[PDB]
Paper text:
Unlike most NLRs, the plant NLR required for cell death 2 (NRC2) belongs to a small NLR group characterized by constitutively high expression without self-activation. In this study, we discovered that SlNRC2 forms dimers and tetramers and higher-order oligomers at elevated concentrations. Using cryo-electron microscopy (cryo-EM), we performed structural analyses and found that SlNRC2 adopts an inactive conformation in both the dimeric and oligomeric states. Structural comparison shows that SlNRC2 dimerization and oligomerization act to stabilize the inactive conformation.
In contrast to the tetrameric and filamentous SlNRC2, the coiled-coil domains in the dimeric SlNRC2 were not well defined and hence were not included in the final refined model. The C2 symmetry-related SlNRC2 molecules in the dimer form a ‘head-to-head’ interaction through two interfaces. The first interface is facilitated by the packing of the N-terminal outer surface of the LRR domain from one protomer (SlNRC2A) against one end of the three-helix bundle of the NBD domain from the other protomer (SlNRC2B). This interface involves tight contacts of the C-terminal end of the α-helix from the second LRR of SlNRC2A with a short loop region which links α9 and α10 in SlNRC2B. Additionally, SlNRC2A Tyr506 from the loop region N-terminal to α22 interacts with SlNRC2B Glu271 and Arg275. The N-terminal end of the LRR domain of SlNRC2A symmetrically stacks with its equivalent from the SlNRC2B molecule, forming the second interface which mediates SlNRC2 dimerization. In the structure of the dimeric SlNRC2, the N-terminal end of the SlNRC2A LRR domain is wedged between the NBD and LRR domains of SlNRC2B, hence stabilizing the relative conformation of these two structural domains. A structural comparison between the inactive SlNRC2 dimer and a lateral dimer from the ZAR1 resistosome showed that the SlNRC2 dimerization interfaces overlap with the lateral dimeric ZAR1 surface mediating resistosome assembly. As IP6 was most prominently detected, this IP molecule was modelled in the extra cryo-EM density in the dimeric SlNRC2. On the other hand, these two LRR residues, along with the three residues from the WHD, directly interact with IP6/5 from the top. These interactions result in a total of 13 salt bridges and 4 hydrogen bonds between IP6 and SlNRC2.
Author numbering:
A (entry chain A), B (entry chain G): 134 to 885
Amino acid sequence: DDDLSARGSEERKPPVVEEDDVVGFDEEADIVINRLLGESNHLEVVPVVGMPGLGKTTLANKIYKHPKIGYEFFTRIWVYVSQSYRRRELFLNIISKFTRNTKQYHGMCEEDLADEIQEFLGKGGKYLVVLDDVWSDEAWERIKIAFPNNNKPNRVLLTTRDSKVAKQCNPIPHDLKFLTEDESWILLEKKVFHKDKCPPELVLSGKSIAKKCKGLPLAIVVIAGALIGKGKTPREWKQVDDSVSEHLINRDHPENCNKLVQMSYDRLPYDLKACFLYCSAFPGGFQIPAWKLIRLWIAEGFIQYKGHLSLECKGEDNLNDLINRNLVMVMERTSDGQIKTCRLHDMLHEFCRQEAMKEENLFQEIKLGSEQYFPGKRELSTYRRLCIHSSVLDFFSTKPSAEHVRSFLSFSSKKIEMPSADIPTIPKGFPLLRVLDVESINFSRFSREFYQLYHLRYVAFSSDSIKILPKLMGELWNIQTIIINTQQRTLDIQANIWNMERLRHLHTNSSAKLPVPVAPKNSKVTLVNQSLQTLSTIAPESCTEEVFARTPNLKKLGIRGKISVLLDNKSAASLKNVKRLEYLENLKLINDSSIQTSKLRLPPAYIFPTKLRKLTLLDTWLEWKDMSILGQLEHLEVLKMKENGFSGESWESTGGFCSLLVLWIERTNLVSWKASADDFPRLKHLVLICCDNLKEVPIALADIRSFQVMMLQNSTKTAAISARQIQAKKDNQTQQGTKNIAFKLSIFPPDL
Amino acid sequence: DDDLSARGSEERKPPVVEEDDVVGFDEEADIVINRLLGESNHLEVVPVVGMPGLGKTTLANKIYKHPKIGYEFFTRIWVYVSQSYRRRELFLNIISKFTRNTKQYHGMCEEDLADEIQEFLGKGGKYLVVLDDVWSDEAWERIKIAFPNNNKPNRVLLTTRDSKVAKQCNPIPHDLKFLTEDESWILLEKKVFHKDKCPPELVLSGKSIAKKCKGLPLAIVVIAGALIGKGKTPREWKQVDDSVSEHLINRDHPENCNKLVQMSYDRLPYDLKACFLYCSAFPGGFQIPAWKLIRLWIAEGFIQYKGHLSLECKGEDNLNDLINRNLVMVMERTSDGQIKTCRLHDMLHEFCRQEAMKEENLFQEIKLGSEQYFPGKRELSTYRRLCIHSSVLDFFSTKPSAEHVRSFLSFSSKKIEMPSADIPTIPKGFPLLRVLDVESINFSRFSREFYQLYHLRYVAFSSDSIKILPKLMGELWNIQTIIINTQQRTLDIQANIWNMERLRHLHTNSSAKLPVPVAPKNSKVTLVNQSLQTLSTIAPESCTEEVFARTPNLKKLGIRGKISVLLDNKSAASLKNVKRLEYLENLKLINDSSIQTSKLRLPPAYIFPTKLRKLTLLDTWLEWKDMSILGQLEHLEVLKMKENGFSGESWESTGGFCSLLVLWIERTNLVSWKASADDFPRLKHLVLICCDNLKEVPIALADIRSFQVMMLQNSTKTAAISARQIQAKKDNQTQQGTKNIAFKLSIFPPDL
Ligand SMILES: O=P(O)(O)O[C@H]1[C@@H](OP(=O)(O)O)[C@@H](OP(=O)(O)O)[C@@H](OP(=O)(O)O)[C@@H](OP(=O)(O)O)[C@@H]1OP(=O)(O)O
Ligand SMILES: O=P(O)(O)O[C@H]1[C@H](OP(=O)(O)O)[C@H](OP(=O)(O)O)[C@@H](OP(=O)(O)O)[C@@H](OP(=O)(O)O)[C@H]1OP(=O)(O)O
Ligand SMILES: Nc1ncnc2c1ncn2[C@@H]1O[C@H](COP(=O)(O)OP(=O)(O)O)[C@@H](O)[C@H]1O
Ligand SMILES: Nc1ncnc2c1ncn2[C@@H]1O[C@H](COP(=O)(O)OP(=O)(O)O)[C@@H](O)[C@H]1O
């Protein structure tokens, strides 16, 4: 008899980078910048202090990516220090950012670990460090031992939310400023309407809203998301106005922000409402892989197929919507421009964890204080999903048991070996499992009970010693996604992939030798699966036309092993088979052999599928003359070569890359590059890493409109000079009135 | 120019059980026993409360062994609950009391583990359980889940030092009373003069001393220890009295007791002073094995060659003196009467640990509060010895590094597996290690660096998968003691045991096949070691005249494998070879085979060594006639058969066991035994386990004067009736007044 919100559903559009500028934060950035290099030849910290959600990390990032900072300091490191940081991993990451080899530093202790960072940071010159979210003095005191004072100016900028810690760091703390009402309205309007200005009738309500928030940017962001969610009518704006007035009666108290979030969370469609709380199953501050979160959504059953739109495409669309609402923060992006990593804001993570734990009983995490004890069987029976990120081996020593647990997730930081006597603890404890993400857990083997988990839907695991997948592994029919990581070079699959009815993905690091696909003699059914979309690394010998036949809709492919077999005339038909797969859009060719036993030549262009959009090559040692073949591809859009992908000293672009957007060349011995503006009409991003041997970059690239961003790392001085000429040329073109997209140039070593 | 305490050193004599009776505590014992059957068909607790060292444990143990308690309750369990108790091990031990095989319980959870105990006590009926040293209320609440409230008259008796927990467990705690002045004097006299009476001259002094102890038995006993250390002269007693009055002005301060202990510690000779404090390296409340502790003293170098006594004998004498002074209390004793296990009292343990860690810097213990962090490299550099009993894997993940560490020992009840990545951590850290006890830690392998560490002197370790000892393991020249535990049935020694000159004792839990002794071709030196004292479990095939020739100082020999190979005279002469050992006290034979493929016959008497005093047979399945040969042996004093070592339905006593003092028979098929008093003149203790078939026990054995203690477990009711007839004859002896120690008969089931 009663119904509300009766309306149709419209389209939601892609999340292109926007509002890259920070509103009004530049003055604070400049005042902070002034205190940098205040006293040469000394190490000092610059505290930044304020309440959560105010914009401290936005300022820190704006400074860290400022031009003057990059020019002044050759070395710069960004490190995250959470509430629950760990020092050894932090030092490993710091050392890794500089070093190239991982083995040397692993056997060392944290003090000898700090000494290497000391020398590394000291040698170059001036260095600027950034510390995010430091909670206690002891954290800073323990961390700082790594930072050396090498008689030259070196600075560190740290952000914290408590006044006492900042007092201890420096006698005088820097205190951030709340936005003025005009700035509040400007930010709200820019976020809600993007380029377009606010309609006159909506202006009066928008001004009142901006004013209530009090100038805390996070509240303005959340309210803007809610406003775009609702739709634009004067009545709707009045309706949001009345509520925001109530919520913003007290502006400084914490819970108010939570209430605002609740508002934004209420309007969310019920499909996205579970996806949004699921993101908070991960640890606070964790960087979520986009593909792994979207796959964990389909297996949970949060995503429901509705017509033609694919489950994975739909899930990516959901993530784009969540980002657009400003609920999810986009940490990184791919070369394609698509999202790569994401995380939730601290306050939003708290809200989501509390809601999912208490109101909805979606999952529970087992976090133990020292006095506390691990729960017993009775309580665990009530749980539906588990999540253990802290000590889990101690949890499994208890020999837990729970029949009503369907999922288990463990996003540990380290990798933990499972004792041989505890391997059966997982299956026997949880025989009704649906998802099992234990990649941070290393399995020496699998007990027999792993093959009776008939309800398993997604599995990800890591095993150092695994070399053979038993036939029994193919018994389970429910699994839709599998991800495998193994240190062993060769993986032999004995489970029959083709009978498996559900799997929509397969992904491995090692090479995979598929069992030959044979139709049963007595069965009418044919083992063709429409659901499969990838085989990340199949062995070259397994690229037989039958195997390609079994996979109709693979939207991606990848081969690891010897590329010569497919390139060789005897087995050239093997590579020619790739023409069969129509859907292909992403092809990766990795080579592991370290001996250049012969030269390699690409077969003609028509062999490659028509849609191929992204291509990556590693250690193939191909001649730069073959680039014409890859140019003949009409759709190919991102091209990456790494670890000497193309070998040769002279390359002359011959055109063909009509629809290309990104070039990525890494660790090649090219010396002379020749090209014209018509070679790459549509290039946007250009990456050149460790090209220690190339004399010059074609100035013709300066004449191309799509060319937006350029990056050079560990390159020759002449290359940097040519890049600086290109920058000047594009600045002149933009100054000449042409509607040319803005040009940015970064040289990783600024002195090049 | 100044000297003091000039005197000669006199003998110290063995610590035989003495003052088994407790002074003036029978009142509380009968009060607690008066709570017996207070309200039938219900579960309740009896709290005992006081200050540390008052006598709560003594009173509880006196009640537990009381005849009335044993009669009323068939099932009785001792349980120790320290401050650092863990629930899971407690349940397993409780179940181990009832059932022989506990493998089914290992895969279970703690709640089902409690259910099994509850069913077991349901079978039992009336039951009294004792809990010692309960610190917190939550401890009692968590533990009590195991005890079934099945509407039976069952009791819990809990001892605690805190009033709050006692009152919460029961609103009427039993407040223990302080010993009176007369009882104080009598207790002091007993502890000092044992069965001898106090000389009149000292009497007054002792009385004063007793009155100054305030009725705290711990103070009285430690003071008696100090007095026995000083001597028995009036000046010594007066000095002790003055010092006691000096150090015990106050009452409620626990540190006063510590001061008293300090007074005893100062007089202890400098040699014993290292031991006394070393004993505290073990975890608080740990049940220290005697052989392990003594050999640790040997390896560390505290026990140095002085005189002619073997190092092991000197260590055993040291432990006996420590016990005599009442610093170390005796937990268990062997059948022959030697000490088996020991521990240190809580207050004395605290005193020793504080002194060792703070003043002498003998070692350091790493116990971490949750907020706390594991020490850094600088701090660890100043440590000479380490001991980790808490989480050690977390410590090793930090990759510690200290070059001045000479010992690393970790004692625990639960074994832990070492990750492969962590395996190299120990060797790199301690290239100068003098001793290593990682028996709780389990190694699948050892890193190559492990076999290089030449400083090691004692090694104890456990490995589940080890099957072969590599030749490199023989390189290490310093090791004096080795102890190995392996689950594998067969151990292959490839290190040249004879080349190694340092080793004094080798002990194993699995058959070891010795590399055949080879005399070096080019070396004048003979590979004969006088230091070696035993090979606990060698393979039968290893028994050879040459191997025995190598070792002339073996007091103990034990063999595990096929006994038939040696026993047959046609092939080889191994059991004839064992004759060539001048002095062999302990000989053990264990048969792996479960089939009587060949009947086994004992070689003649002249083959056995002259002095054999302890002999153990397991599954040998010899015939009762062969008893005569064992009877022909002259000096035999302890004899044990277990697991059907001697099988047959009829045994007629030949006689001649002139010197036998103890006879242990377990798992025998005998039904009838004929004996006369002259057959076993010197019997002291007789033990019968799980003899569900024997018809009767001989009446003549009751005529043996030396016969003191006899116990029957899981025996026939008719056997128990004959045993009660023997006990009635012993009561008749007591009525007569024969100068034979009073005889007590204990049966595991009272109803038998
Ligand atoms: O799948 P692609 O379109 O080919 O992108 C790949 C992929 O990352 P994403 O799937 O998240 O985009 C790689 O990871 P995997 O496919 O193996 O899982 C990743 O790293 P690896 O090639 O080492 O595996 C690589 O990034 P990078 O070039 O830094 O190595 C690159 O992602 P990007 O296009 O963002 O670089
Ligand atoms: O050495 P003890 O402390 O006296 O223990 C002895 C025996 O040793 P002995 O034959 O030298 O007396 C065994 O101890 P170890 O040989 O391993 O050192 C052990 O028997 P198992 O090792 O075969 O189990 C044990 O057995 P239990 O205590 O169960 O009777 C037995 O104890 P007793 O001292 O009472 O004879
Ligand atoms: N001046 C601003 N303009 C645009 N967005 C802002 C501004 N200040 C803050 N934000 C947004 O508010 C959110 C929370 O701010 P954040 O950077 O986390 O500050 P803090 O770390 O101090 O809470 C961020 O996602 C950021 O995008
Ligand atoms: N009547 C007695 N009361 C208490 N302790 C006694 C008595 N007689 C001897 N002792 C000594 O007390 C020691 C153990 O008891 P103690 O630790 O003092 O009490 P509790 O363990 O209950 O605190 C034994 O070594 C024993 O020698």
